[PDB]
Amino acid sequence: GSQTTAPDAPPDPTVDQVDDTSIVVRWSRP
Amino acid sequence: MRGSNAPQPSHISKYILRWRPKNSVGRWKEATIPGHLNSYTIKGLKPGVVYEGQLISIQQYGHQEVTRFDFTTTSTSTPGSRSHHHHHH
Numbered sequence: 593g594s595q596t597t598a599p600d601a602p603p604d605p606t607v608d609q610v611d612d613t614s615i616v617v618r619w620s621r622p
Numbered sequence: 623m624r625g626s627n628a629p630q631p632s633h634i635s636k637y638i639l640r641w642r643p644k645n646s647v648g649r650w651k652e653a654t655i656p657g658h659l660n661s662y663t664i665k666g667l668k669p670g671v672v673y674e675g676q677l678i679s680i681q682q683y684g685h686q687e688v689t690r691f692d693f694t695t696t697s698t699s700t701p702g703s704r705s706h707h708h709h710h711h
Contacts, residue, residue, distance in 0.1 A: 596685070596687060598631060600631060600632040600681065600685065600687060601679075601687040601689060602677055602679055602687060602689045603689070604689065604691055605675070605677050605689060605691050607691075607693050612669050613665060613666060613667055613668065613669065614663055614664060614665045614666075614667060615663070615664050615667055615693065616661055616662075616663055617639065617661065617662050617663075617664055617675070617677075617691075617693075618660055618661040619637070619660055619661070619677050619689065620660065621632075621634055621637075621660060621679065622632035
């Protein structure tokens, strides 16, 4: 269940620079 | 300075990037990223195929945070939606 009530969960990762078969997925860590 | 010693409950040991195409309900592809990086270049993504993604941050305390995301969903395929026909000013 949702045990983690603390904000140590990474926000929605951003996908940029989409190639034919590759991307840059960037995430924000706490 | 001043030691700065503190058991901060936010220390990632490794980030696991899991992705799987929506046409497959089988296995996820797993890539492990060192727990000090913030971006990964995923190679092996089919163009025009919707993928499911999971970022699992394994924290040193054995704490697992799974951030579920998606790819090939933001398709700005606007078919020339011209609503502008009034000149401002």
